Structure 1
Amino acid sequence: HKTFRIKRFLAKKQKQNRPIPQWIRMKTGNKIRYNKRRHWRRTKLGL
């Protein structure tokens, strides 16, 4: 039992839980080395 808004929030939170693309490490001024990753057990969503 979910609402549409909760489900959309969950979908957005799911689409953000991926590693960075590797080619971004090759850019000219890149300071990132890895991804704000979230684990369902380690950290809980704001609900």
Structure 2
Amino acid sequence: SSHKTFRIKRFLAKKQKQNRPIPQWIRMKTGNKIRYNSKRRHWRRTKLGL
């Protein structure tokens, strides 16, 4: 909602920040083994914990 507490807004901030694709130069690292961000989240598909 529009009304929210500071703690909720800070929680939503971190989830927003970490919901981004991995860098392209990560794929070039040695012994990478990482294909794509497996922890991506979409607002409509998966709802946050709160």
TM bracket, shorter-chain basis: over 0.9
Question: Gaps (5+ residues) in structure 2?
Answer: none
State, as a whole percentage, how many aligned pairs show the same letter. Answer: 100
Deviation at 1:38, TM superposition (A): 0.2
TM-score (norm 2): 0.92
- Runs of 4+ off more than 2 Å: none
Instruction: Give the Cα–Cα distance (whole angstroms) in 1 for the partners of residues 16 and 27 of structure 2.
Output: 23
Residue 31 of structure 1: how far off its partner (Å): 0.4
Aligned length: 47
**For each residue in 1:6-46, what CA deviation from the matched residue of structure 2 results, as whole angstroms up to 9, or x when unmatched?**
00000000001100000000001100010000000000000
The normalised TM-score by structure 1 is 0.97
CA RMSD of aligned residues (A): 0.4
Unaligned runs of 5+ in 1: none
